[PDB]
Design an enzyme around this catalytic site. Structure first.
Site, mmCIF file in Angstrom:
data_model
loop_
_atom_site.group_PDB
_atom_site.id
_atom_site.type_symbol
_atom_site.label_atom_id
_atom_site.label_comp_id
_atom_site.label_asym_id
_atom_site.label_seq_id
_atom_site.Cartn_x
_atom_site.Cartn_y
_atom_site.Cartn_z
ATOM 1 N N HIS A 163 0.853 -1.184 0.000
ATOM 2 C CA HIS A 163 0.000 0.000 0.000
ATOM 3 C C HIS A 163 0.893 1.240 0.000
ATOM 4 O O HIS A 163 0.728 2.101 -0.865
ATOM 5 C CB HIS A 163 -0.942 -0.030 1.221
ATOM 6 C CG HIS A 163 -1.595 1.279 1.554
ATOM 7 N ND1 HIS A 163 -2.803 1.648 0.989
ATOM 8 C CD2 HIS A 163 -1.205 2.244 2.421
ATOM 9 C CE1 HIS A 163 -3.099 2.825 1.512
ATOM 10 N NE2 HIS A 163 -2.162 3.231 2.371
ATOM 11 N N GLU A 164 1.856 1.311 0.956
ATOM 12 C CA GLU A 164 2.817 2.412 1.117
ATOM 13 C C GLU A 164 3.733 2.541 -0.104
ATOM 14 O O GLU A 164 4.058 3.663 -0.493
ATOM 15 C CB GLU A 164 3.653 2.239 2.395
ATOM 16 C CG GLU A 164 2.890 2.537 3.679
ATOM 17 C CD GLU A 164 2.453 3.977 3.885
ATOM 18 O OE1 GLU A 164 3.329 4.873 3.896
ATOM 19 O OE2 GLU A 164 1.234 4.206 4.058
ATOM 20 N N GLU A 205 -5.293 7.436 -1.037
ATOM 21 C CA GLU A 205 -5.276 6.241 -0.192
ATOM 22 C C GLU A 205 -5.958 5.084 -0.917
ATOM 23 O O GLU A 205 -5.418 3.977 -0.941
ATOM 24 C CB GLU A 205 -5.942 6.507 1.168
ATOM 25 C CG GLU A 205 -5.048 7.212 2.174
ATOM 26 C CD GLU A 205 -3.780 6.473 2.556
ATOM 27 O OE1 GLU A 205 -3.877 5.431 3.241
ATOM 28 O OE2 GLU A 205 -2.685 6.938 2.164
ATOM 29 N N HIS A 211 2.144 4.566 -3.053
ATOM 30 C CA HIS A 211 2.310 6.025 -3.046
ATOM 31 C C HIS A 211 3.569 6.428 -3.827
ATOM 32 O O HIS A 211 3.585 7.478 -4.474
ATOM 33 C CB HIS A 211 2.374 6.560 -1.607
ATOM 34 C CG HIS A 211 1.090 6.426 -0.849
ATOM 35 N ND1 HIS A 211 -0.089 6.981 -1.320
ATOM 36 C CD2 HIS A 211 0.849 5.839 0.348
ATOM 37 C CE1 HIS A 211 -1.008 6.696 -0.414
ATOM 38 N NE2 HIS A 211 -0.493 6.010 0.610
HETATM 39 ZN ZN LIG Z 1 -1.466 5.309 2.497
#
Ligand SMILES: [Zn+2]
Ligand SMILES: CCCCCCCCCCCCCCCCCC(=O)OC[C@H](COP(=O)([O-])OCC[N+](C)(C)C)OC(=O)CCCCCCCCCCCCCCCCC
Length: 427
Positions: free
Chosen positions: A290-291, A370, A294
């Site tokens: 997920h990170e 997100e 970004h």
């Molecule tokens: Zn995030």
């Protein structure tokens, strides 16, 4: 545009009208946020029973533990917020800022006066807020078993952070004030580029030098988790250098995970509260995926481009409004128009409506960013592992699944758990 600004009123004042406008806006924004706070506080007090949709997410014991915690946090949030909003209003009306400026007296002379004014202002700032801070960690975070801090660690850290703040604040401010006072007539371009360098330098330096002073940073030991992270890093073409495990368990039971770097030297930072109790290796990788999203979707680069676009627009309007003696006289400065005071009045009070709108727009963007990072984690195949992780992390941080729509739309930078889980279930 300019011809209408020269019109004089035989019924209303000039400097007094714009000062009141600042305070009237500061209080309506506060009352708007308090209405939202009241609206969400009602949700915590009303929803005492676990919903059927949020039934698999948290059990009745964990839900009531979360309910009590968010209720105590809401009560504190109000009074600590009310004290701040009263303090700000009272200092402004009592004429604190100009009198403090007089007390920090008796181009080098103005920069020194600015520097000592800053040192005293942050001293009062730190000391006046420290009892509220001491209450939050030792009464709220301690009652709900999150806090792991001792009174000594809290005190030693407060001084550590306060000292490091000044050592960054004082040289950056003195060099910033110098560029505005010396440079011209296009000083705003030189001042914007200095903050541009200082921002990107502090971004790379922080986790490598500033952050390991307050929290214990140790490299992640070799194992199944350490090997699988490198496999994922090579897969996304992420130039991973080192993986760290931060001793977050010394402060609180709250979990966290992030990345940092410049170009080919990127490093992953994990909390022991997320790895231990925490989340399984399969769930940790999904949280990383997920990170890492970004990074790959360029959310990181886009956020810097927005922040530097905002400061360019701000420094430009500052250069346009710094000459106006009406905005200084509004706050009590009649004898002189100081540079640091000009930065405070225009950036924190005149730009207040813009700053509030921009923040709301960036919160809306953060939620979208997100969802994109969650969609990227599903694109990696770790959708089932992130679904389990998000719930487990929510249970770990006693996050209430129910939330007032108007509150979460304005404040929540991350979309609600039920909204994020449903997007992952669909994928
Ligand atoms: Zn995030
Ligand atoms: C190690 C420390 C590294 C420090 C790196 C500093 C880079 C500074 C670049 C200044 C460019 C000036 C251009 C004039 C209006 C124009 C605004 C432009 C804003 C965007 C600037 C570029 C952002 C680059 C992001 C890099 C991501 C990797």
């Amino acid at each position: 545009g300019m011809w209408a600004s020269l019109d004089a009123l035989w019924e209303m004042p000039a400097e007094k009208r714009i000062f009141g406008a600042v305070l009237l806006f500061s209080w309506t924004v506060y009352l708007w946020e308090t209405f939202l706070a009241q609206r969400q506080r009602r949700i915590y007090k009303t929803t005492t029973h676990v919903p059927p949709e949020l039934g698999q997410i948290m059990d009745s014991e964990t839900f009531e533990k979360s309910r009590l915690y968010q209720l105590d946090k809401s009560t504190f949030s109000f009074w600590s917020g009310l004290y701040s909003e009263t303090e700000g209003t009272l200092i402004l009306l009592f004429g604190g800022i100009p009198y403090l400026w007089r007390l920090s007296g008796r181009p080098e002379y103005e920069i020194t006066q600015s520097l000592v004014f800053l040192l005293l202002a942050t001293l009062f700032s730190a000391l006046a807020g420290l009892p509220w801070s001491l209450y939050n960690t030792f009464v709220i975070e301690e009652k709900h078993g999150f806090n792991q801090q001792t009174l000594g660690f809290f005190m030693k850290d407060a001084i550590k952070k306060f000292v490091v703040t000044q050592c960054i604040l004082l040289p950056v401010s003195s060099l910033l004030l110098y560029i505005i006072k010396i440079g011209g007539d296009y000083f705003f371009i030189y001042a914007w580029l200095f903050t541009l360098v200082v921002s990107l330098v502090l971004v790379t330096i922080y986790a490598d030098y500033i952050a390991p002073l307050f929290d214990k940073f140790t490299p992640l030991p070799e194992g199944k988790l350490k090997e699988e992270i490198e496999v994922m890093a090579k897969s996304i073409d992420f130039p991973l250098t080192k993986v760290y495990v931060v001793e977050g368990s010394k402060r609180s039971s709250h979990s966290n995970a992030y990345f940092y770097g410049f170009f080919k030297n990127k490093r992953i930072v994990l909390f022991d509260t997320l790895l231990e109790q925490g989340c399984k290796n399969e769930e940790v990788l999904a949280v990383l995926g997920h990170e890492l999203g970004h990074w790959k979707l360029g959310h990181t680069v886009k956020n810097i481009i927005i922040s530097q676009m905002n400061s360019f627009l701000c420094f430009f309007l500052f250069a346009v409004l710094i000459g106006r003696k009406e905005l200084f006289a509004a706050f009590g400065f009649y004898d002189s128009q100081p540079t640091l005071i000009g930065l405070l009045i225009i950036f924190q009070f005149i730009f207040s409506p813009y700053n509030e709108v921009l923040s709301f727009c960036l919160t809306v963007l953060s939620r979208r960013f997100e969802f994109q990072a969650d969609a990227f984690a599903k694109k990696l195949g770790k959708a089932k592992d992130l679904y389990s992780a998000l719930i487990k992390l929510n249970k770990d941080n006693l996050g209430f699944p129910v939330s007032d729509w108007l509150f979460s739309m304005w404040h929540y930078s991350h979309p609600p758990l039920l909204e994020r889980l449903q997007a992952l279930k669909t994928m």
